[PDB]
Design an enzyme around this catalytic site. Structure first.
Site: not given
Ligand SMILES: Nc1ncnc2c1ncn2[C@@H]1O[C@H](COP(=O)(O)OP(=O)(O)OP(=O)(O)O)[C@@H](O)[C@H]1O
Ligand SMILES: Nc1ncnc2c1ncn2[C@@H]1O[C@H](COP(=O)(O)OP(=O)(O)O)[C@@H](O)[C@H]1O
Ligand SMILES: Nc1ncnc2c1ncn2[C@@H]1O[C@H](COP(=O)(O)OP(=O)(O)O)[C@@H](O)[C@H]1O
Ligand SMILES: [Mg+2]
Ligand SMILES: [Mg+2]
Lengths: 467, 493, 89, 464
Positions: D185-186, D159
């Protein structure tokens, strides 16, 4: 320095006090109902400090007949219950009043029903097996002496019958004191238990505390605390082993949720009080064995609508050492006790405690039953013949095993007319090991239904003609 | 000096008029040594959560502000001690010498302050180490229904850290923190006993919030553990924090919020429960070399109901974490233990968290297991199945039997490499399924007994060399000659 | 209760689907070389393919019903929670 | 004319102002936490006017350490983010502050994140196709210029490499730029993406905007608008074809739901915010082609409980034009990009747009691949030889087609020394028309891995 009633909405009463005379939380207040047909003395537990010298309280007795602005007297202490060996052999309500002998125990020592749990340091895990004599319980759900045992299950699956069976199999020969707490259950059940204990001469060692389901929510919430206070006195002061039976613990939670909204709390999921887990934790952590002092607690846990995901039983699960979940499906198949072997558990059912043979046999039985459960739907739709020879053999073995896990209980004689039976642990292990090896595949499955040990199995098989 | 007055109090909450200069989340001192946290601030009063002994709170009592937000002591003295969410010992072993204090809400490392996860954190569980590897600084969820072995997995990881601890090198040692939220006190005692039997309390701290504690303690315990771990992480050490379990913390925080009349959402949870868990779990990072290179690995636990992973809190935590280990009771009852569902469990860190030998040996394991799951339905018709698919089903069966593991028995990484080597190199094809496990164990013992050089090579080089591979195959063949099956047959060839 | 029953029916239909697909493949192999034959008595590969397709359709319908019930349960739970909160407002 | 805090309930803060100084809705106010441990500057967004000069605001930072009555300054405008060519190659948060270099971009032009979509007349009535240069994307699931593309993919499926390839292709072929919006977002994944883009040199061509999972809901809800505003500036004031990645859009929806719950609004069906559709449309309607310049978007979409009738995905898919699904199966077979041709789809795969020949060839390829996927189970279980001769030849042809849908991506030049290829749409159409006709069955399967046009196919053929 006394307060007066300001608001009354069912079991919740608001009371206004003079400045500086506001009662402490959980204090017991006394109010008078003077109506001729309903004259009595309401006991109110201070639940909230509303400010402006107002306090919201839960009524232990029905509030019908109460009048606004009536005298309310503060006792200065929480609800207390009598303690001592004198309680043994008598029946009390949540407030400590004796039922079989009114006015009895008024001179004993009185302990507040609100207490802290034992310090974490004093807590010490328990791992001794408690042998009952039921095949399913002994094999798949071994019970712990001094541990916490629960009998989960929906309505009418056999929780109360199993509690009576365990009273017969454990309390009768017990060398210590027993405390029964009937929390929000049927009054007829309480009378039956009282008469049964009197008949078996076990009442003399048993203290009964009853709060029935027709009592206001306050009694149902505090009766368990009263019984637990008596048990705690026996554990900590007398220093003797205690048997504690509670039926039904879920009634405590239900009563807690009944008054939650009336106390101003917003409802949590499934219409439960936000403090569900907190109250459950307090009550359940007060029920425990400390280092050198053993309490064997057995609790019947109602599962609302057979839904084990309900927040009440789900929260309760974490507080137990051994759990026996009774299933509606097993109950409807005619298997008694209606234990779900796949959903049951025991913290001591590992090789270290129960031994290698017991663990191996239990795991094999569980595996066979799980595979049979998997094949249930294929059998229902396509029929058994379409399974493999190994799958058919496993299905027959599992049917026989599930029938054999059933037993004729002593407390069930009034329901089947058949006298009960007891099976020693070693015989149970040997018989189930033989079953998992296919040693009895020739016998009809009906031969395994509601019997005791292998001798009863042979007798039933020859009665049906098999051998 | 500012003094507030308690105007109302009920089921763990107390409203205090006054203290106009009190901060949000500030600690407050109620009489009798009671402690509260100012959570709701408005023009009328301050709604504070009582951390314990709520019954001692009365209307009109005098409340003093501490001037400090919630903070906990932190230091090396916490290793082997059991403390409550305030850092106070509850094991009855005296005071704890605190190096310093840490606020429970210090911000997590920024994007620039981290580095990519590149060090393995060997859990000692073949299934996890091979299929869903966990690296240092990663957040790996352990999600499943009750009685599926989640606590078992976490305790096995903590036990497995013992050899690394004994090495004495701070770059290999892992300091373990175990947070127990809403657990039976005797259960925490059992967990401590299990850790002690394995010599794990020498490097493990337990933050205990038993079920009898106030909702405030159940809400704060994960943050106390996180701060204790952070103190070590920022000083170059490596930490492993286990939360058992975040679902109970979410329930306690929901109780607190509802009692504070905050607007409820789905499942009555407030609007910042996801924020609660994300804030908790984003403090487990892998610091850059400029900040000492320390790290903290998170192992949160989630207890689903009826295997419903689409519930609210499970969904939030699954979204937050870098990977999931799904434990299913159906596999548990089938004999698969640890009952990790390899089909759905995933580790987004992946091979970056594995040593070279483990990555090489475990490459084919995923394909074999997926293919075995595909072929399951045809076990009754081995004759119909072609040669390739028949041997493929057999290999899958051996592999599934291989990943099983007894409780409280973590494996060293070299031993795991050798076991998976047996599994994926056809050295179990000649063994009965029921014997595989036993065979495995015995073989490992044999390798320790006389051929430890294979383990030494794997450990020191992290690679199974060609000559090491040949020696391992030779030892396997000799053991097969000497091995005795349960059915009495032979396994050679 | 309806959600639990729907989930049980979904797993039942799934097991039926896998067993029928296995039977279809085995029947294909046997052709290349009991009553589950479709209408031979009134072929087994055709019957098992039809059964697997019907199981697929049943699984899809049951999944749609289960998702509808899940959404309805969430909405009703929130309705009760917010009704209580508004009452206490 | 400065306000003062009155109530603090988590990330919701009530602020009082003088009678004539009440800020407008969505205005950014600034408060201060002075406590040493948690000292910071809170950014508050005016959410409601409560009357009596009180405004309810959502704090963009945790409110710990905030005191009642502290001065609250009003900036006079909503959250404004820096814009211009300077933001490329840098990381910003939802409030416009640079994370890789604090203070950077303070002197740039600042645009308010709340903007209307293009006027009705400005909208281009004709849907246009975007030529990515990838064979699979161009043929089976043509992307819409100024459209929205759903992205689906598990771990280790390529991805991020696909996002990188799209960044490089938009930067080179179309002379545009890229804006990445990490919603929820991490921090680990954000750092990983930062490092990867820096390593691959495509960071210079992209601007990153991270609203992280550790932040309160307000930032997680406004970060997408911030990134969209940067992309809008690039499209409008600089005449560039922007590409806007959003990961994850469902997390934007969830942040909106959380903010709605915090503000006290009654949840709608399934517990989502009452204005779910309005918010989703407000975000998505700004992603359009106008004045010959477009913002094409690839949005990672999470479907709760895998239920596409769930309100969040149901609303999101109302604005999505194409759908690319990445599969572990295709990744395992070495096909790159690991796009699932059967699962993926595109709304513009009709003759009215892509023409008759394109649609015909795409449908033939899809039919062949679907038939082979049907055979796959028999092939796996009973063996390949069981198949009839026609089934054998169709299996071989479908395998060749499946391999030829792979391609050596430009972003793959780092992992393998082979440079990427750009296959023109006509070349792809004619090549796959030839393939479906069996004109390349004599060639080995190996000839069809990771190549460009027909010239590359022939060259690799002689190489073998
Ligand atoms: N690998 C294993 N092999 C055998 N038994 C195991 C294994 N792991 C766990 N068990 C047993 O399974 C039971 C449940 O394990 P454990 O309590 O650790 O799981 P859990 O899901 O965290 O439980 P709980 O519902 O109490 O939180 C215990 O009897 C434990 O001994
Ligand atoms: N061992 C048994 N044999 C036959 N019937 C039983 C047995 N145990 C329970 N039952 C049946 O289950 C019903 C419920 O019993 P009880 O346990 O009193 O209710 P609950 O399960 O709700 O506590 C009874 O009507 C009884 O007939
Ligand atoms: N064209 C390609 N050639 C070789 N490997 C690739 C290619 N595309 C993707 N990969 C592999 O796919 C894996 C995942 O890539 P990426 O999408 O960057 O990360 P994620 O797994 O987080 O999506 C990488 O390990 C990479 O080696
Ligand atoms: Mg009963
Ligand atoms: Mg556990």
């Amino acid at each position: 320095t006394a307060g007066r009633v300001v608001r009354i909405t069912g079991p919740v009463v608001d009371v206004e006090f003079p400045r500086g005379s506001v009662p402490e939380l959980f204090n017991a207040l006394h109010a008078e109902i003077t109506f001729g047909a309903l004259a009595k003395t309401l006991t109110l537990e201070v639940a909230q400090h509303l400010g402006d010298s107002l306090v919201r309280c839960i009524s232990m007795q029905p509030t019908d007949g109460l009048v606004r602005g009536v005298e309310v007297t503060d006792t200065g202490a929480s609800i207390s219950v009598p303690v001592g060996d004198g309680v043994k052999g008598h029946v009390f309500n949540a407030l400590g009043d004796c039922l079989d002998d009114p006015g009895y125990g008024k001179d004993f020592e009185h302990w507040s029903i609100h207490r802290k749990p034992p310090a974490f340091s004093d807590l010490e895990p328990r791992t001794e097996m408690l042998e009952t004599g039921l095949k399913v319980v002994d094999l798949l759900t071994p019970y712990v002496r001094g541990g916490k045992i629960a009998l989960f299950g929906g309505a009418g699956v056999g929780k109360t019958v199993l509690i009576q069976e365990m009273i017969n199999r454990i309390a009768r020969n017990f060398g210590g004191t027993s405390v029964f707490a009937g929390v929000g259950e049927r009054t007829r059940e309480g009378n039956d238990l009282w008469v049964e204990l009197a008949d078996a001469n076990v009442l003399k060692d048993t203290a009964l505390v009853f709060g029935q389901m027709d009592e206001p929510p306050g009694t149902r919430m505090r009766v368990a605390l009263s019984a637990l206070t008596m048990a705690e006195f026996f554990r900590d002061e007398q220093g003797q082993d205690v048997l504690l039976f509670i039926d039904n613990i879920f009634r405590f939670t239900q009563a807690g949720s009944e008054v939650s909204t009336l106390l101003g709390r917003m409802p949590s999921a499934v219409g439960y009080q936000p403090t569900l887990a907190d109250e459950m934790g307090e009550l359940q952590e007060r029920i425990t064995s400390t280092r050198g002092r053993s309490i064997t607690s057995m609790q019947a846990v109602y599962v609302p609508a057979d839904d084990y995901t309900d927040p009440a039983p789900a929260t309760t699960f974490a507080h137990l050492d051994a759990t026996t979940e009774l299933s509606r499906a097993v109950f409807s198949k005619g298997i008694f006790p209606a234990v779900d072997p796949l959903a049951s558990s025991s913290t001591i059912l590992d090789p270290a405690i129960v031994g290698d043979e017991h663990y191996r046999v239990a795991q094999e039985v569980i595996r066979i039953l799980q595979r049979y459960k998997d094949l249930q739907d294929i059998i229902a739709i396509l029929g058994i013949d379409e399974l493999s020879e190994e799958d058919k053999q496993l299905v027959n073995r599992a049917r026989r095993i599930e029938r054999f896990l059933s037993q004729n209980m002593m407390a069930a004689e009034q329901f089947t007319g058949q006298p009960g039976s007891t099976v020693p642990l070693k015989e149970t292990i040997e018989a189930f090991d033989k079953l998992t090896k296919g040693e009895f595949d020739h016998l009809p499955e009906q031969a395994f239904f509601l019997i005791g040990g292998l001798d009863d199995l042979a007798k039933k098989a020859e009665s049906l003609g098999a051998k | 000096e500012e003094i507030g007055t308690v105007i109302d109090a009920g089921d763990g909450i107390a409203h205090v008029e006054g203290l106009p200069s009190v901060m949000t989340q500030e600690l407050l001192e109620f009489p009798g040594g009671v402690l509260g946290v100012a959570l709701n601030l408005d023009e009328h009063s301050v709604g504070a959560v009582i951390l314990g002994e709520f019954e001692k709170i009365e209307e009109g009592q005098q409340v003093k502000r501490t001037g400090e937000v919630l903070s906990v002591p932190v230091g090396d003295a916490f290793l082997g001690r059991v403390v409550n969410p305030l850092g106070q010992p509850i094991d009855g072993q005296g005071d704890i010498a605190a190096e310093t204090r840490r606020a429970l809400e210090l911000q997590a490392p920024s994007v620039v302050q981290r580095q990519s996860v590149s060090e393995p954190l060997q859990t000692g569980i073949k299934a996890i180490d091979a299929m869903t590897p966990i690296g240092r600084g990663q957040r790996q969820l352990i999600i499943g229904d009750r009685k599926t072995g989640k606590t078992a997995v976490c305790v096995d990881t903590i036990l497995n850290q013992r050899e690394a601890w004994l090495t004495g090198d701070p770059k290999q040692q892992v300091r373990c923190v175990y947070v127990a939220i809403g657990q039976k006190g005797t259960t925490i005692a059992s967990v401590k006993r299990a850790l002690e039997e394995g010599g794990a309390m020498e490097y493990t701290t337990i933050v205990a919030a038993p079920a009898s504690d106030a909702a405030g303690f159940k809400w704060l315990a994960p943050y106390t553990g996180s701060a204790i771990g952070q103190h070590w992480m920022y000083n170059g050490k490596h930490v492993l924090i286990v939360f058992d379990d975040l679902s109970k913390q979410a329930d306690a925080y929901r109780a607190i919020s509802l009692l504070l009349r905050r607007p409820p959402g789905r499942e009555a949870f407030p609007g910042d429960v996801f924020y609660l868990h994300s804030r908790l779990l984003e403090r487990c990072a892998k610091l850059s070399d400029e900040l000492g290179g320390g790290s903290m690995t998170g192992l949160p636990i989630i207890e689903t109901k009826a295997n419903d992973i689409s519930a609210f809190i499970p969904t939030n935590v699954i979204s937050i974490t870098d990977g999931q280990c799904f434990l299913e009771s159906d596999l548990f009852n089938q004999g698969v233990r640890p009952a990790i569902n390899v089909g759905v469990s995933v580790s987004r860190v992946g091979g970056a968290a594995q040593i070279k030998a483990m990555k090489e040996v475990a490459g084919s394991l995923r394909l074999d297991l997926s293919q075995y799951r595909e072929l399951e339905a045809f076990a009754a018709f081995a004759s119909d199945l072609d040669a390739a698919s028949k041997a493929q089903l057999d290999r899958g069966a051996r592999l599934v039997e291989l990943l099983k593991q007894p409780q409280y028995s973590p494996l060293a990484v070299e031993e795991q490499v050798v076991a998976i080597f047996l599994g994926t190199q056809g050295h179990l094809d000649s063994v009965p399924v029921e014997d595989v496990q036993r065979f495995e164990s015995e073989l490992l013992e044999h390798v320790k007994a006389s051929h430890s050089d294979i383990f030494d090579g794997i450990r020191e080089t992290k690679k199974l060399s060609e000559e090491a591979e040949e020696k391992l195959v030779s030892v396997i063949n000799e053991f097969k000659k000497g091995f005795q099956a349960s059915d009495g047959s032979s396994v050679v060839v | 209760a309806t959600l639990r029953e729907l989930r049980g029916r979904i797993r039942s239909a799934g097991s039926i689907k896998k067993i029928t697909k296995a039977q279809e493949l085995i029947a294909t192999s046997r052709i290349a070389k009991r009553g589950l034959c479709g209408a031979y008595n009134a072929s087994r590969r055709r019957a098992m393919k039809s059964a697997t397709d019907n199981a697929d359709d049943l699984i899809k319908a049951l999944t749609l019903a289960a998702n509808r019930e899940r959404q309805a349960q969430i909405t009703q739970e929130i309705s009760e929670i917010v009704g209580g909160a508004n009452a206490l407002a």
